[PDB]
Amino acid sequence: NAEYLEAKSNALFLKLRMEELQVLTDCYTPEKVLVHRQIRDTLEAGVKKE
């Protein structure tokens, strides 16, 4: 019983982690990453001037 409950807990945690990483791959495509970089650079230049 102790072994079974341990195996169940580990499987649920791995499912949750897999689904998180799949969502992150869908959100940050190379095109978007480039844009996010441009926005950073403008924001960083503003923070520095102010």
Binding site: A2, E6, S9, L16
Partner: protein, 51 residues
Amino acid sequence: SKTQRALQKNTNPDTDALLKSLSDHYSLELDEMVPKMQRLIQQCEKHQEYG
């Protein structure tokens, strides 16, 4: 003599040996199994937070 013979036939395991085995088994469960289960409980709580 009949009662002593009946005690010897029924004595595997010796009541004192049996009580010792029972006490050892009880200690083993508290030292190994109970903490393992507590660790697993704590891990589950962390996974919830990860959720």
